[PDB]
Structures are given as structure tokens and as C-alpha cells.
Design a protein around this ligand. Structure first.
Ligand SMILES: CCCCCCCCOCCOCCOCCOCCOCCO
Ligand SMILES: CCCCCCCCOCCOCCOCCOCCOCCO
Lengths: 187, 187
């Protein structure tokens, strides 16, 4: 009687605190470790929410509760399909693991020498500003590592889950020997 | 017997789906509406997680479970105090409501004419790039609305929850009559 209550509450207390943690610190801009915990919680949350609605539809309070449970069941299923479609289509255009981050669907692809570095774009703009400070690149407010201003890519790819856009370098200014600025516009 | 199970499960099914929604779409870069739902969920999650641990400490499985519950109770309380301290200190330096967003603790303050517009900074850098395109301002990859390039602030404030930084305009270039670029560095 009381023992079953205690095991029930203890397990749920752990889960609710875990949801609070991933809801407060589960962001790649805060802690990459907590972000992966949130993603594992969200991956488990889709079928659990669906399966919980399947239960409330098999054992409902009334007919309206049975229908609502089925609507919520499809809702959990539709959100997972939607997430998988966007993340897959983004991953095929980028190959980066930021494609699976629901928080960001705009990705900036910049080729630095051999490989291409992908970073999430917060604001989808028609223009992106490149700033090389003494040999260190900063694209659209976020750093991209070391790169020579002369070896700046003439084209930069932005990847949304439904379209891949290319940005050609319109303007190019050099502040120093390796310091400079450049702009990119779509077409 | 079975009826209590049905009402209990139906309520939790709604809650778990709501957590899934706010965990998947609760971001200001996706939907401002879903973001506020997440914040209401998180504000309710702190005392609920604490109160649930208080229960498992009053009615524990064993002595170790009683101690763990008390540790989680203080953990839920410490995270809320931490969030409130950062958000308040940020709100006093900025006055913006983005200070209460746990996802962002770096805020960019740019004075556009009469008032000052604040936007969250993803990457805390020592430099911030200003780009005015035909009379539209873009600071660090995100737009700030209409502004004249001539009317660009000589100083821009960055506000972290523990320090307020000022950025003086080092370089200034004009691409056109109202189009131009500028950079800001801290001190
Ligand atoms: C930037 C650093 C700021 C300070 C960091 C503080 C670190 C957090 O401190 C928390 C320690 O406080 C102890 C809280 O006490 C826990 C209460 O537990 C009750 C035990 O119940 C068991 C009963 O059998
Ligand atoms: C930024 C760091 C700020 C640190 C602040 C930490 C504050 C933590 O508060 C600790 C208080 O929480 C302890 C909760 O324990 C109470 C449980 O009560 C159990 C009593 O059992 C009665 C038995 O009948």
C-alpha cells in the first residue's frame, strides 16, 4: 500500500528534477553535456507521450476522453515525424550533427581549407558578414576558427530544412595584412 | 480502482505531451508562444520538483532514499535561486525581458535613437561587428531594425550576469551613402 507509493514517488521525483535540469541548462550555448541529456530525454519523451496516450485511449474515462487521447497520440507521432524529416533533410545538406538540434534549423556552412565547418544560424538573413581579426574568422557573430583573409571562401552555404542557399561574396575589404572584412549575399 | 487509474493517467498524458512540445519547440528562435509556455512550465517545475522531493524525504523508502531526496530538494531550490540571481542581475543591467531566458546570458545593448534595443548574444566575443545595409542595422549576425549609418552609437554595451562591458568603436567604414560597416572592442 504505502511502499508502492514510495517507490512510485521516488522514481518520478528523479525524472521531474531531470526534466527541470534539461529545461534550464539543456542548451548548446550553456552546457553541451546537459544538451545531450535533454536530447536523450526528448528521444524517450516522444514514444512515452505517444504510448501514454495509447493507454488513455484503450482505458478512457469517457468517449470524448478516448478521442482526445487518440488526437494526442497522433500529435506525439506527428511531432516526431516532423522532427525527423527536418533533421534528416538538414543532415543530408550539411552532414553536421547540429541538424538534429531542434533549437536551430538555419545552418551556416563555411569551407575552411580541407573540410567545412557548420554552425547554427540564429537569424536567417539575406546577408552574412565575415570578419577576420588577425587571422581568426568570425561569421555572423560566431567564431569559426583560424583562417587567412586571402583564403576566404568566395561562396558560403546556408542550409534550411527545405532549401539550400548559396551566398556569393559581394564586397571585400582588408583592414590589415591578415585582418579584413567581407560580405555575402544570396541568389 | 480502475477509475482512479484513468483520471490519473489522462492528466499525466496531457502533462507529458506538453513537456514534449515545450522541449521540442520551446525556443525564441522557433515560436515565441511555445517559449512562454515552456517558461510557465519551468516556473512551475521548480517548486513541484522541490515539493516532490520533500514528499520522498518525509515518506522515504530507506535512510539513503531520505538523504538523496533532501539533496535533490536543495538542488531544485539552488537552481531556482541561481536562475533568479542571474536573471535579476541581468534585468537590472539591461531592463530587457531576455534576461529571464535561461538559454541566453549574454545580451547586446544598442541605443537606437530614443530607446535601447537589447538582443541575446550567442557567442561572447571581445569584438562585435556592425553592418548597416541601406539603412538597416545588423549587429553580430542579428538584425536590430531601421537605423541610419550616420546615427550609429559610438559605444555598445554587453551585459553578462556578473559584469557589464562597454565596446568602443575602433574602425568605421562606409560602403555607400547609408551603407557601411563598423567594429566595436571592449576595454
Ligand atoms: C559561485 C558559487 C556560489 C556558492 C555555491 C554554493 C554551492 C551549493 O551549496 C549547497 C550546500 O547547501 C547544503 C544544503 O543542505 C541540504 C539539506 O539537506 C537536508 C538533509 O536531509 C536529510 C534528512 O535525513
Ligand atoms: C546559487 C546557490 C544558492 C544556494 C542556495 C541553496 C538553498 C538550498 O536550500 C536547502 C533547503 O532544502 C532542504 C529541504 O529539506 C527539507 C526536507 O524536510 C525533511 C524533514 O522531514 C521531516 C520528517 O517528518
Amino acid at each position: 500500500v504505502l511502499r508502492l507509493v514510495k517507490d512510485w514517488n521516488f522514481t518520478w521525483s528523479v525524472v521531474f528534477l531531470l526534466i527541470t535540469i534539461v529545461l534550464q541548462y539543456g542548451y548548446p550555448s550553456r552546457s553541451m553535456f546537459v544538451y545531450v541529456i535533454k536530447m536523450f530525454v526528448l528521444w524517450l519523451l516522444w514514444p512515452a507521450s505517444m504510448a501514454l496516450s495509447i493507454f488513455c485511449a484503450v482505458y478512457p474515462i469517457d468517449l470524448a476522453s478516448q478521442i482526445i487521447s487518440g488526437i494526442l497520440a497522433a500529435t506525439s507521432c506527428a511531432m516526431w515525424i516532423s522532427y525527423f524529416v527536418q533533421s534528416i533533410r538538414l543532415f543530408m545538406r550539411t552532414g553536421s550533427w547540429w541538424s538534429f538540434n531542434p533549437e536551430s534549423n538555419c545552418l551556416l556552412n563555411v569551407p575552411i581549407g580541407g573540410t567545412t565547418v557548420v554552425r547554427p544560424l540564429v537569424e536567417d538573413s539575406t546577408s552574412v558578414t565575415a570578419v577576420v581579426t588577425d587571422g581568426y574568422l568570425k561569421m555572423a557573430g560566431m567564431h569559426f576558427g583560424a583562417c587567412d583573409f586571402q583564403r576566404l571562401p568566395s561562396e558560403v552555404t546556408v542550409a534550411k530544412p527545405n532549401v539550400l542557399i548559396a551566398l556569393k561574396m559581394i564586397k571585400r575589404q582588408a583592414y590589415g595584412t591578415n585582418s579584413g572584412v567581407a560580405i555575402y549575399h544570396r541568389y
